Amino acid sequence: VIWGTDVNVAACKENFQRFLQRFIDPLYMQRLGEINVIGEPFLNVNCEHIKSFDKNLYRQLISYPQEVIPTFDMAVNEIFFDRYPDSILEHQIQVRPFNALKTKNMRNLNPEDIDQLITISGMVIRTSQLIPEMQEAFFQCQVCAHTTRVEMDRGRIAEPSVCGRCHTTHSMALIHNRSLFSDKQMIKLQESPEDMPAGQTPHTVILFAHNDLVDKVQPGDRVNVTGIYRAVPIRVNPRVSNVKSVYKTHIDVIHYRKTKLFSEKRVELLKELSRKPDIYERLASALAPSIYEHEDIKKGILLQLFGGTRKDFSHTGRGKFRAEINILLCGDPGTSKSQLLQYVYNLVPRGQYTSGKGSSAVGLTAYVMKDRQLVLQTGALVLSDNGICCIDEFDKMNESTRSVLHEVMEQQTLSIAKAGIICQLNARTSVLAAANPIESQWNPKKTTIENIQLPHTLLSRFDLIFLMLDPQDEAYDRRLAHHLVALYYLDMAVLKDYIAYAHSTIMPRLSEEASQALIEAYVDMRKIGSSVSAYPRQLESLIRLAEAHAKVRLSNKVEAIDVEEAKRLHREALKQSATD
Amino acid sequence: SGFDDPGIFYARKSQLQRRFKEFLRQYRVGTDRT
Amino acid sequence: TVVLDDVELREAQRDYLDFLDDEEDQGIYQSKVRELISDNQYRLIVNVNDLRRKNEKRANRLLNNAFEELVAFQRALKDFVASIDATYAKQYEEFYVGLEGSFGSKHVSPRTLTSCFLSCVVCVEGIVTKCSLVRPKVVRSVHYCPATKKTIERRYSDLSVYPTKDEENNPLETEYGLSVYKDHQTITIQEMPEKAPAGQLPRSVDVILDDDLVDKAKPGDRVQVVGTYRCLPGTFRTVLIACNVKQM
Amino acid sequence: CPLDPYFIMPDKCKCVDFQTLKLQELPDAVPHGEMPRHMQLYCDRYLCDKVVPGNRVTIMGIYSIKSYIRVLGIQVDTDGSVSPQEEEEFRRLAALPNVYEVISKSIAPSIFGGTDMKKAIACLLFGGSRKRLPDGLTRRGDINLLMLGDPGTAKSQLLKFVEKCSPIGVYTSGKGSSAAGLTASVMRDPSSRNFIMEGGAMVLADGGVVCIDEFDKMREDDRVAIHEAMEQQTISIAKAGITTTLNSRCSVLAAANSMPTILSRFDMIFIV
Amino acid sequence: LKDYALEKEKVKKFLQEFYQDDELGKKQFKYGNQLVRLAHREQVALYVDLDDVAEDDPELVDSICENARRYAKLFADAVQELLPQYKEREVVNKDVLDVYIEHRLMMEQRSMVRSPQNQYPAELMRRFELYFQGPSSNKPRVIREVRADSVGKLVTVRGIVTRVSEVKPKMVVATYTCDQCGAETYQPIQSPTFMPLIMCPSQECQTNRSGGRLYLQTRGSRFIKFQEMKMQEHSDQVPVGNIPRSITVLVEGENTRIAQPGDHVSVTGIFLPILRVVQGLLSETYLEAHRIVKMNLTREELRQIAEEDFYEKLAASIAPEIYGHEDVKKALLLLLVGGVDQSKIRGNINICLMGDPGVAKSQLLSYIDRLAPRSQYTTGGLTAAVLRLTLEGGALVLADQGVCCIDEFDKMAEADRTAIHEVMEQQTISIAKAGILTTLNARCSILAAANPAYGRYNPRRSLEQNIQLPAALLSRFDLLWLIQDRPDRDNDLRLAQHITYVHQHSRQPPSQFEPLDMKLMRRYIAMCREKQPMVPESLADYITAAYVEMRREAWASKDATYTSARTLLAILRLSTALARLRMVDVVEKEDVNEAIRLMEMSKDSLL
Ligand SMILES: Nc1ncnc2c1ncn2[C@@H]1O[C@H](COP(=O)(O)OP(=O)(O)OP(=O)(O)O)[C@@H](O)[C@H]1O
Ligand SMILES: Nc1ncnc2c1ncn2[C@@H]1O[C@H](COP(=O)(O)OP(=O)(O)OP(=O)(O)O)[C@@H](O)[C@H]1O
Ligand SMILES: [Zn+2]
Ligand SMILES: [Zn+2]
Ligand SMILES: [Zn+2]
């Protein structure tokens, strides 16, 4: 065996080659045919299959990944020289294993795991251009043009310092383009923040795609990266050979996995309680228990959590539909709006919290910045591409920001003309905006536009405008206080799993009952407004709400009850916003 | 803290030394009878 | 660059004192030093084989390593004499160790005394041919500086050279009484003429004697000497420092 | 690290035995009328001291230059050292009844004025027998002749002839001026300031013949040594008590004109 | 002066033969069992109590303390020697390092005398970490007391973590392979930097002279967890005339990740020099970490507590030289004791002060900071930062349930205004220098102080008309007190009389109750923190009755008086805070009423 290891080249190759041919879910030889037909010589492998097939080889694999992988390549190439012995390929088959060790708490990583293959889930934050890394430097004498090359002198390139033909002093200068190069794109990735237990100090690591798997993942992608953990010294000065006793560590990526749920008991349990007739009311009341005397608002945000079913309108040429729900909660200061956003943001997965001010630390926009790599820093909206962005003080925002919010609400994407090029960053978020009335309190008889002073277009894009006020009712003050002092002296986990499963599995589809009910609702609203009348945007909101309400019941189809309650809440939002 | 130096620890001439070593110890003289 | 403690020498010095501490045992060496105190000499004689019996390792160390081991032993001897009698110890600046008994391979002859025994104890046997006059050799010269009112020393030991002026160039007048001198004589041994092949050349070995060992030899004496064979400063002349001489 | 000066510490400076020797080309191997060359021999470990000058030996070593040899192995001619045709001629020669007369006549025809001295020289060249007595002592097999009289007579040519004729023929003079001279000599080489023993002509010609011009003019120490040398074929050099003995079993042809006790020990003598 | 081999046997005896009666009086070789765990790879960090050595050899303990580094190596090698004895199982080859160690041992066994170089470093025969724990006798030492005299010794200290670097791998033994002879070369490392080896000193390449060029191998080499931190003197340690002093501390191995900035920790370890030449060499010092622990009267005193005017007397003792403002002085006292945080509740009592310059405001904060057991003073750094690569906590973090007095509050940067908003909201500080929202537990009470712009306050101009702060942020404060420079010739004359006495006496005029020593005050506070009074539900009825009454007054008021559930919760904090002052574990109606009185006065201050 190679020194300091338990690794036999032939036996490991034979065992791996045996695993390729002999497997129980044989799929490896089938995708070998796909690679032979397609010609893409990279054969990615789930390492857990090797664990199931042979844990010792899997253990042996992880211990010495750099050494075992060439054996794996030799196994597959000879298999390709066995299966499809004749073919044409620009390079022979490679392998990109993945999904081996879910020690994904990058905050919990140790020097014990140096040069051991690992996979971790995280969100790529910053990227770069593929670094042209020199690997063989052609050289030419200034005196006699002596042609020579130096090949892979251990990262650095050894200067000749003396010619070979005329043998003069140092005259052989490198020729850049004649030199050989490879691609090494550097990538900076943040540890998956939801996965972290505390999150008090989110972790970031550098990654490198060397000559392969380059540029395939753009910033903001929450993916599982699999590669070899690696550490290197750093010279105290470039000129001197002294180095620090501490090594900065990075990853040489091998595979990117773009990214069942729970066990049978949870799906059984959530399906059991879904059958409760008042699950919609219980879940609404159960949502945010610290709140008191708010049910319409709780139901609306609850429908926003479930959201409408994803709809692919590519065939229609109509563009992407805003399947997500955006609700603006407008109410007096001290009315629990901030607590509602914090509770939802804390509860919700892959969500974000920001404030309308530009002083918000996260920032609701993405823009370039130089280290001096002019690299793009993302935004909370782009970060919450599928999550929920809880925006506080939405009334106090800049017009440039308001234009951005109109765009993403109109498109669920953000267009940024970085440098000169333009990029459309998808943001399919659910926007939980919170605004407060201008002046000390909300002046009655003044419209939301008057008392918040925002464009009619942008506020109209919000499917729901929930108006809440603190009434001047001492009984309400008395009951609220008793509720608080009662609190002075269902768990969120089950509700979170319910919503996640409903997102994952249940995708409500329309019923003609829902179709006719919605059409009846809109024309009734049109007739009421015939004498701020009805608009087809209101129909779209009613469409989305019924999808969410159907998703709440896990019916997997939109029913008339979804339409009826959606119209009820839509009228409640109208009643809350009614002014005439 | 730099105040002490740890000691570094750890045609072919050693091959030739082995050749002499096997020669001296393993060289056989005489015959099966003797 | 000033030594503080030597654990090995500490143990070796201790072990010798333990060996010389012959009270619970048969009392032979305690009686010897008591006789040495009464007889006023300052050179104990020791059978090496008894040292092997009490400590084979130390005896091996003594034979293989001479100069260091004896110095520890002399230290143990001087303390041991000081234990039995402080004032008698204080009479003499130092004390000496005499080896005896069987020396397995170190018992050689001037023909067979090769350079391999350098810095090893050797028990040579032969005949004394050349003898030099007794001479007193300075070892520790003591000087006084009336300008500075200061007294200094300078050992020589194994080591223009004589200091006569202060570093300030003040005169230094020596202190003869304070200084230390010791009689010193050189002789030469050869193989016994009867057992000496004519083909081989003569192999004559020098010997250095000091203190009471000076006059305990004459030419034409069949003598066994035990000592430490050492080189000299410079192809280097080599001489044997006698630790004890006996006339067989 | 004081600069170039450094202090050697003899306590740890391990050493080994050391010895230098001088080796000369054999009298057989030297070309006719040419001086044998000399080579320094360096023997340090147990190989050193195994030999004394006057031993016929063969060495194996390393040719080296500072010009000398580093010795690695020694073989000493403890005893002994020829085409059949040469033997048959020699057998034929002995078969001749007048081989005595042929040998006597054929030796020195160039010189004139020889009568039965040729015969004596012949018998000297053959020599007697180095007998071993039953007691174990040995008697000198050599035979030594002395020529006294006219230096005008060309006996020097006869000495030059016979030494060339002898298998081991060394021709020197009693005033030969060699530092060793005829016999051994111990002298402190001032270059190294150490005693270097050197063999003289007699020991060099061991088993051979020695031609000595001006034998009357032997050196005083040479005069002392020649007594035992003729009487015992052995030069004894004394170093206080131990005295090395060098073997010189060489016949002696002496030339002179006019110490007298040595003349009693000569086997034979003739006047010019 | 002492043979380490002899000391090596004593510790080996002590390790193999020390035991203590564990739970249920189980006679157990505590270290021996850990040795069994260590041989099984079940333990890595082996913390050693020195008091166990003190149990049978206090002389050895002092010798250990006199040179801690030496005895640490002795203890480590003793464990290295005794590991095969306690080995009973051959556990699985945990990580490459064990199997690489085993392969190294096999080749060594495949080799008879051997040169010292051709043998593995003892520090490569490792994966057991060894540390000590300071004796109870050696009291914790103030940082300022630790000087060059105590270098080369083990000591215990206490302080506050100002900053910690991220965990990084520090090399222990560089490993290389010869280019030609293929022999392994080792290089233990001591200094924070070093030069990599080039030519292999192995015997074969040494003899062959084949130009064997060493090339490092990370797999061969051995690393260790390693982070850097700078503890700071505790507030009590520093005299009033002095300032805190930092001590770099190097945490390594298992000890890492055990602390955060602002943690009031206690560290035991060796104080040693690091050389990152007049009459000797000058070299920076540090404290090599071994153990880290994150820490938390007479009868007449009780009679004084029983006095009904006790808290009133204590209130008078808060800046007695500051004539008047006694109701405010009471409010400051409530802040110092804080709330209860029953379950949770935000027991912090953030108080904001506004008023014209020259009203003892600045002086009041200074007295509070002096009186406060743990406190920070700032003007407006305040928040954390990522220095360039270390988390450096701001004064808000360094409060850590103390109090962050903030003068010049109105002139704070608006970014900091947002930051303190989070602090009062969640008691946490989120900071993102590199877009990384690192969150720090900044639990503390905030005592703010500001003045109206454009000179003195104008009652004709509304609140926030004279001050440039978000009105919402003002509502977040538990109390907000206004001070106005009303020229009141008599009261102003009374203050002038007070000042002249102080000039003529360097003391305030003799009050009804003399002020008490600040230590006595802090002792009472510490006793008050012991209590966590509860709220009986009967009190809730009256509490709610009072709340709706004042809320009605707010509706009656033309200007909204910020009454909300926030106001109710603050009243709950004050009442239970008063209950702590009473040393009574039940909030009284009296406590509720007084809190409402202060609330009303704070509202009345808005007049
Ligand atoms: N209807 C209600 N039910 C329960 N709690 C309430 C209600 N109204 C107010 N509260 C309480 O009042 C306090 C309001 O705090 P919070 O900061 O969330 O208010 P907000 O209205 O979002 O404020 P702002 O608009 O000024 O940011 C919280 O304690 C909240 O629990
Ligand atoms: N009510 C008071 N009682 C006693 N001394 C007072 C009072 N008000 C002000 N002083 C004295 O005023 C002097 C100077 O003003 P002071 O330091 O109190 O200003 P300040 O209120 O902190 O002002 P600012 O916040 O504008 O800097 C202080 O020495 C303090 O003793
Ligand atoms: Zn050229
Ligand atoms: Zn020097
Ligand atoms: Zn080598």
UniProtKB/Swiss-Prot annotation, chain A:
One of its GO terms (biological process) is double-strand break repair via break-induced replication. It catalyses: ATP + H2O = ADP + phosphate + H(+). Disulfide bonds: none annotated. Sumoylated; SUMO2 modified in response to stress caused by inhibition of proteasome activity (in vitro). Keywords: Acetylation, ATP-binding, Cell cycle, Chromosome, DNA replication, DNA-binding, Helicase, Hydrolase, Isopeptide bond, Nucleotide-binding, Nucleus, Phosphoprotein, Ubl conjugation. ATP 2 binds at Y292, K337, S338, N436. Residues 279-485 form the MCM domain. GO terms for cellular component: chromosome, telomeric region; CMG complex; MCM complex; membrane; nucleoplasm; nucleus. There is a cross-link at K260 (Glycyl lysine isopeptide (Lys-Gly) (interchain with G-Cter in SUMO2)). Its EC number is 3.6.4.12. One of its GO terms (molecular function) is single-stranded DNA binding. Early fractionation of eukaryotic MCM proteins yielded a variety of dimeric, trimeric and tetrameric complexes with unclear biological significance. Specifically a MCM467 subcomplex is shown to have in vitro helicase activity which is inhibited by the MCM2 subunit. The MCM2-7 hexamer is the proposed physiological active complex. Belongs to the MCM family. Component of the MCM2-7 complex. The complex forms a toroidal hexameric ring with the proposed subunit order MCM2-MCM6-MCM4-MCM7-MCM3-MCM5. Component of the CMG helicase complex, a hexameric ring of related MCM2-7 subunits stabilized by CDC45 and the tetrameric GINS complex. Interacts with MCMBP. This is DNA replication licensing factor MCM4. It comes from Homo sapiens. The chain holds residues 151 to 775 of 863 of the full protein.
Swiss-Prot record, chain C:
Its main location: nucleus. Keywords: Acetylation, ATP-binding, Cell cycle, Chromosome, DNA replication, DNA-binding, Glycoprotein, Helicase, Hydrolase, Nucleotide-binding, Nucleus, Phosphoprotein. GO terms for molecular function: ATP binding; ATP hydrolysis activity; DNA binding; helicase activity; single-stranded DNA binding. The modification Phosphoserine is found at S157. GO terms for cellular component: alpha DNA polymerase:primase complex; chromosome, telomeric region; CMG complex; MCM complex; membrane; nucleoplasm; nucleus; perinuclear region of cytoplasm. The keyword Hydrolase applies. GO terms for biological process: DNA replication initiation; DNA strand elongation involved in DNA replication; double-strand break repair via break-induced replication; mitotic DNA replication initiation; regulation of DNA-templated DNA replication initiation. It comes from the Eukaryota. Transmembrane segments: none annotated. Acetylated by MCM3AP. It is found in: Nucleus; Chromosome. The keyword Transport does not apply. Component of the MCM2-7 complex. The complex forms a toroidal hexameric ring with the proposed subunit order MCM2-MCM6-MCM4-MCM7-MCM3-MCM5. Component of the CMG helicase complex, a hexameric ring of related MCM2-7 subunits stabilized by CDC45 and the tetrameric GINS complex. Associated with the replication-specific DNA polymerase alpha. Interacts with MCMBP. Interacts with ANKRD17. Interacts with MCM3AP isoform MCM3AP; this interaction leads to MCM3 acetylation. Belongs to the MCM family. This is DNA replication licensing factor MCM3.
Curated annotation (Swiss-Prot), chain D:
The modification N6-acetyllysine is found at K160, K164. ADP binds at R139. Residues 99-272 form the MCM domain. Transmembrane segments: none annotated. The modification Phosphoserine is found at S83. It comes from the Eukaryota. It is found in: Nucleus; Chromosome. Early fractionation of eukaryotic MCM proteins yielded a variety of dimeric, trimeric and tetrameric complexes with unclear biological significance. The MCM2-7 hexamer is the proposed physiological active complex. Component of the MCM2-7 complex. The complex forms a toroidal hexameric ring with the proposed subunit order MCM2-MCM6-MCM4-MCM7-MCM3-MCM5. Component of the CMG helicase complex, a hexameric ring of related MCM2-7 subunits stabilized by CDC45 and the tetrameric GINS complex. Interacts with ANKRD17. Interacts with MCMBP. Interacts with TONSL; the interaction is direct. Acts as a component of the MCM2-7 complex (MCM complex) which is the replicative helicase essential for 'once per cell cycle' DNA replication initiation and elongation in eukaryotic cells. Core component of CDC45-MCM-GINS (CMG) helicase, the molecular machine that unwinds template DNA during replication, and around which the replisome is built. Belongs to the MCM family. This is DNA replication licensing factor MCM5. It comes from Homo sapiens. The lineage of its organism: Eukaryota, Metazoa, Chordata, Craniata, Vertebrata.
From Swiss-Prot, chain E:
InterPro entries: AAA+_ATPase, MCM, MCM7, MCM_CS, MCM_dom, MCM_lid, MCM_N, MCM_OB. It is found in: Nucleus; Chromosome. O-glycosylated (O-GlcNAcylated), in a cell cycle-dependent manner. ATP 1 binds at Y323, G358, A360, K361, S362, N451. A motif (Arginine finger) lies at residues 475-478. GO terms for cellular component: chromatin; chromosome, telomeric region; CMG complex; MCM complex; membrane; nucleoplasm; nucleus. There is a cross-link at K13, K26 (Glycyl lysine isopeptide (Lys-Gly) (interchain with G-Cter in SUMO2)). GO terms for biological process: cell population proliferation; cellular response to epidermal growth factor stimulus; cellular response to xenobiotic stimulus; DNA damage response; DNA replication; DNA replication initiation; DNA strand elongation involved in DNA replication; double-strand break repair via break-induced replication. Keywords: Acetylation, ATP-binding, Cell cycle, Chromosome, DNA replication, DNA-binding, Glycoprotein, Helicase, Hydrolase, Isopeptide bond, Nucleotide-binding, Nucleus, Phosphoprotein, Ubl conjugation. Residues 310-500 form the MCM domain. Early fractionation of eukaryotic MCM proteins yielded a variety of dimeric, trimeric and tetrameric complexes with unclear biological significance. Specifically a MCM467 subcomplex is shown to have in vitro helicase activity which is inhibited by the MCM2 subunit. The MCM2-7 hexamer is the proposed physiological active complex. This is DNA replication licensing factor MCM7. It comes from Homo sapiens. The lineage of its organism: Eukaryota, Metazoa, Chordata, Craniata, Vertebrata.
